[PDB]
Structure 1
Amino acid sequence: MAKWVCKICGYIYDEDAGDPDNGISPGTKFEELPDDWVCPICGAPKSEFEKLED
């Protein structure tokens, strides 16, 4: 699945990993993260992530 970078801090939202400590099961696509999910490292909103693909 896809990976996304937090443009602020460099955290990778890896769809295969999810974010279980913050309520997101492995395999959750970035689009399906709740609108108010934030980077678990720096707190940036979803808008600040960039999909790692051409």
Structure 2
Amino acid sequence: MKKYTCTVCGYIYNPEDGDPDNGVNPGTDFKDIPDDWVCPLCGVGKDQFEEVE
């Protein structure tokens, strides 16, 4: 699974770690994160994230 970065603040979503404090468990692909989730550091939506290639 690919990492995704918040293009507003630089936070990296790592699917190995998830974001468990906000209900995203380890092993969750970015696409399967509920679409109302926001960047845990800066608060913007998923639509400001881009795949890390």
TM-score (norm 1): 0.93
Whichever residue aligns with residue 30 of structure 1, its letter is F
RMSD: 0.6
Q: Which runs of 5+ in 2 are unaligned?
A: none
| Identical counterparts, % of pairs | 58
Whichever residue aligns with residue 37 of structure 1, its letter is W
Q: Which runs of 5+ in 1 are unaligned?
A: none
Name the CA distance, whole Å, in 2 between partners of 1:44 and 1:27.
22
Q: What secondary structure, in the 3-state scheme, does the structure 2 residue paired with 1:50 have?
A: strand
Deviation at 1:25, TM superposition (A): 0.5
For 2:45, the equivalent position in structure 1 comes to: 45
